[PDB]
Amino acid sequence: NYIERVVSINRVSKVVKGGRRFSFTALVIVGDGKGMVGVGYGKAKEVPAAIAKGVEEARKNFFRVPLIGSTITHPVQGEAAAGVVMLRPASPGTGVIAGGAARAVLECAGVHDILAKSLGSDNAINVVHATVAALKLLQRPEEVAARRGLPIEDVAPAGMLKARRESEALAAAAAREGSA
RNA sequence: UUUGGAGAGUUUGAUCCUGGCUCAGGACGAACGCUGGCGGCGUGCUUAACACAUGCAAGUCGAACGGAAAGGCCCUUUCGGGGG
């Protein structure tokens, strides 16, 4: 059930003795819709083969996204070559609101509620890399408290833990109709 | 202890970056074009502090005053009017 999302298709041109020898590049994000996401860049003579290579590269380099509900743990500004993407968590119902690249990677990760904004290098590839760098900079409170050597309560805020418990209930207790 | 940022196109054979230009949105004391049924609530010289016909826009008090021109009342009466 992996959700896949192409963001950009570009006809690139090598030049040779005869002339322009073309190919196609597909930027394909794929995700589980629940927090695992991967990015791929497929380069191939034909568009569908490019997309397939992108899918394969993505499913190879999947990575897991920290979440507290259907948003992210904390705000974070990821940088790439020159893509700069701030991410800011958001209350539920405001909706993932972002440009098509950040939007695609977030929607494939399953982040339905988030604030995002590209601040440099409108190019979708570097934007996606910047967004991914942000998501990799993300830090779940459990591993944070481990990193500190403390409880979770005295490093994380009560609002985050409230939403955490709420989401955990709505996951487990509401998985009853799926498990039975 | 609550909150709220979307991008796209365009330099190149193609790429990335920078960088500008443009667009998508919202608003208006608005104007124009096409069109036009109803109501409600508002709103209307943003320019010539340019010139202005005309009519109204600051009067009131007779319990401040002399008074009595118009009405009123009463005497008068040639019914013309005259007095208080």
Nucleotide nearest to A86 (CA to C1'): B5
Distance CA A42, CA A60 (A): 13
A43-80 as b/e, with b when 16 or more CB fall inside 10 Å? ebeebeebbbbbbebbbeeeeebbbbbbbbbbebebbb
CA-to-C1' distance for A69 and B17, Å? 37
Query: In the 3-class helix/strand/coil scheme, how is A103-165 assigned residue by residue?
Result: HHHHHHHCCCCEEEEEEECCCHHHHHHHHHHHHHHCCCHHHHHHHHCCCCCCCCCHHHHHHHH
| A115, A88 Cβ separation under 8 angstroms | yes
What's the rounded Cα separation, in Å, for the pair A98 and A40?
20
Q: Which nucleotide is nearest to A77 (CA to C1')?
A: B5
CB A130 within 8 A of CB A85: yes
Footprint of strand B on the protein (CB under 7 A): A 10-15, 20, 81-83, 86, 88-91, 94, 97-103, 115-118, 120-127, 158-159
**Strand-pair category, A96-97 with A114-120:** parallel
**Sequence-separated (6 or more) residues with CB below 8 Å from residue A55:** A4, A28, A30, A40, A42
Residue with tokens 């589980």: A32
CA pair distance A129, A134, nearest whole angstrom: 9
Q: Which nucleotide is nearest to A102 (CA to C1')?
A: B6
Can you read off the two tokens belonging to residue A132?
């991914």
Q: Kind of pairing, strands A3-15 and A20-31? A: antiparallel
* Protein-contacted positions of strand B (CB under 7 Å): 1-10, 13-19
